[PDB]
């Protein structure tokens, strides 16, 4: 009721383009069409492929009146035991960051300007029998940041070698 939404990935219906770095090697915009409605997600799953440091940054969001924003994530993480021999290079977490700016820097992404909010861990991993039966465990996690002081902000997601699908990213403030 009293919430004002500033960013909503799933409501955009695949139309938000989030920046990825390194380009073409990590996070990817995916779709699933097994229901009446298409489902979109940002996914990465380079679990047995050497060290990973894959970044995904949102579009610029004008904060307006918001002083404190609340960030709600919905996501799946596959069990590292789904991947044979990967008990060393496979992870089940990813990291959430943000940055404030008075202008949209566009494709200029400088990870050095971003502040870490938290490591995001799944309450429930999706095990192989789930995945193979098309029955994922969707996690829901919320964080907040503030006071905000510039005109707008970005969120970013860092993958360190997990098998993660981001299905919902909703940012709001309370009026």
């Amino acid at each position: 009721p009293g919430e004002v939404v500033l960013l909503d990935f799933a409501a955009a219906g695949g139309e938000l383009g989030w920046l990825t770095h390194p380009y073409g090697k990590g996070w990817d915009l995916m779709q699933n069409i097994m229901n009446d409605m298409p489902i979109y997600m940002y996914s990465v799953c380079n679990v047995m492929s050497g060290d990973q440091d894959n970044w995904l940054r949102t579009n610029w969001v004008y904060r307006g009146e918001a002083e404190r924003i609340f960030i709600e994530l919905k996501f799946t993480v596959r069990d590292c035991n789904s991947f044979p021999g990967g008990a060393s290079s496979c992870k089940e977490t990813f990291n959430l960051y943000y940055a404030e700016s008075d202008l949209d820097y566009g494709t200029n992404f400088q990870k050095r300007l971003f502040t870490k909010i938290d490591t995001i861990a799944p309450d429930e991993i999706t095990v192989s029998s789930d995945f193979e039966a098309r029955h994922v465990k969707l996690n829901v996690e919320e964080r907040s940041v503030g006071p905000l002081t510039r005109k707008g902000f970005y969120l970013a997601f860092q993958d360190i070698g997990a098998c993660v699908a981001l299905l919902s990213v909703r940012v709001y403030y309370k009026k």
């Binding site: 995916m30 799953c45 299905l167």
Partner: peptide, 11 residues
């Protein structure tokens, strides 16, 4: 490996 079942790149 796929992070999500029956998902394909969207572009």
């Amino acid at each position: 490996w796929l992070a999500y079942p029956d998902s394909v790149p969207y572009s």
